[PDB]
Amino acid sequence: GIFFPALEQNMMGAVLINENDEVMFFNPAAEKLWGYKREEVIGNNIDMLIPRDLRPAHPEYIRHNREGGEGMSRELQLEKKDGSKIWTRFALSKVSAEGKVYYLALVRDA
Amino acid sequence: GIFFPALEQNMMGAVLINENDEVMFFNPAAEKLWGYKREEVIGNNIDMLIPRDLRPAHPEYIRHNREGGKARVEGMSRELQLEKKDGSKIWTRFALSKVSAEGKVYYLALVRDA
Numbered sequence: 092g093i094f095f096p097a098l099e100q101n102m103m104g105a106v107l108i109n110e111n112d113e114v115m116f117f118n119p120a121a122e123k124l125w126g127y128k129r130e131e132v133i134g135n136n137i138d139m140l141i142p143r144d145l146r147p148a149h150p151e152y153i154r155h156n157r158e159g160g161e162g163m164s165r166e167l168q169l170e171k172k173d174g175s176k177i178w179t180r181f182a183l184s185k186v187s188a189e190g191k192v193y194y195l196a197l198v199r200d201a
Numbered sequence: 202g203i204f205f206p207a208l209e210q211n212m213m214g215a216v217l218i219n220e221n222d223e224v225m226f227f228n229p230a231a232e233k234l235w236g237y238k239r240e241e242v243i244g245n246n247i248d249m250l251i252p253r254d255l256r257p258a259h260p261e262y263i264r265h266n267r268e269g270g271k272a273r274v275e276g277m278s279r280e281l282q283l284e285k286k287d288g289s290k291i292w293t294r295f296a297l298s299k300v301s302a303e304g305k306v307y308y309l310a311l312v313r314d315a
């Protein structure tokens with residue numbers, strides 16, 4: 092399908108998480124933004140991509156959205172692997188497929 | 202299997218054109234942005250989605266980029282006015298990507314209201 096290439100080669104960083112909040116897709120644009128190689132992210136928890144000072148609050152943000160269920164775009168401060176931070180814009184989408192709830196975040200430098 | 206749904210249900214409008222500049226994918230978000238139902242766009246030249254006063258010049262920019270061979274698209278980087286079916290205008294932000302697949306060059310535009 093042309094849809095995989097469309098996201099894989101996208102100029103926007105793309106991060107897809109499964110029902111268990113594990114990262115299942117992390118494109119090259121995302122690698123550049125975070126400073127992580129997909130090999131260090133795929134299969135691991137979304138928690139590793141969340142800024143350290145937000146790790147305490149982010150889990151509940153996701154949990155609450157999953158149970159009781161959307162899309163929104165706003166600027167967020169991203170923390171890279173090396174600790175440096177950059178402002179970006181996130182376009183978050185809730186994706187329902189085959190009875191499961193996934194989330195795709197499309198990211199752009201800001 | 203999840204890549205299609207991820208774009209189909211995306212909050213961002215998505216427009217995919219093939220090697221002949223014809224629209225092969227136009228999601229619901231794009232329907233809302235432009236005011237066209239996807240069935241009205243599929244198979245047509247991207248020209249119908251371009252503001253009327255820009256239609257004469259836009260084709261050459263796509264052609265030039267295709268002939269260029271560069272991986273990243275640098276243009277359409279700032280806020281642009283999108284013309285809806287009813288003729289009204291709305292400010293938007295485009296994220297243009299050149300997609301190489303099947304030995305062909307496609308373009309995917311991700312759009313949001315700005």
Ligand code: HEM
Pocket residue numbers: 106107108137140141142145149152153156161165167168169170183194195196
């Ligand atoms: C640089 C990394 C990230 C930061 C700083 C961040 C920050 C936040 C913040 C502050 C919220 C609270 C809602 C609001 O914006 O007011 C939130 C909610 C959320 N985030 Fe993230 N996030 C990041 C990455 C991700 C990723 C990669 C995913 C998954 C693909 C994700 C999924 C969600 C979900 C599902 C919610 C709940 C949305 C809702 O309330 O409807 N986030 N995030």
Ligand code: HEM
Pocket residue numbers: 216217218247250251252255259262263265266274275276277278281282283284297308309310
């Ligand atoms: C609201 C509709 C649209 C408007 C107003 C618009 C406007 C423009 C303008 C003014 C340029 C030339 C200046 C620049 O590079 O910034 C341009 C270039 C271009 N546009 Fe569009 N466009 C629209 C939709 C699209 C769509 C749907 C596609 C394809 C999926 C597309 C693909 C391109 C390409 C490939 C270029 C050449 C850019 C480069 O060489 O870097 N445009 N567009």
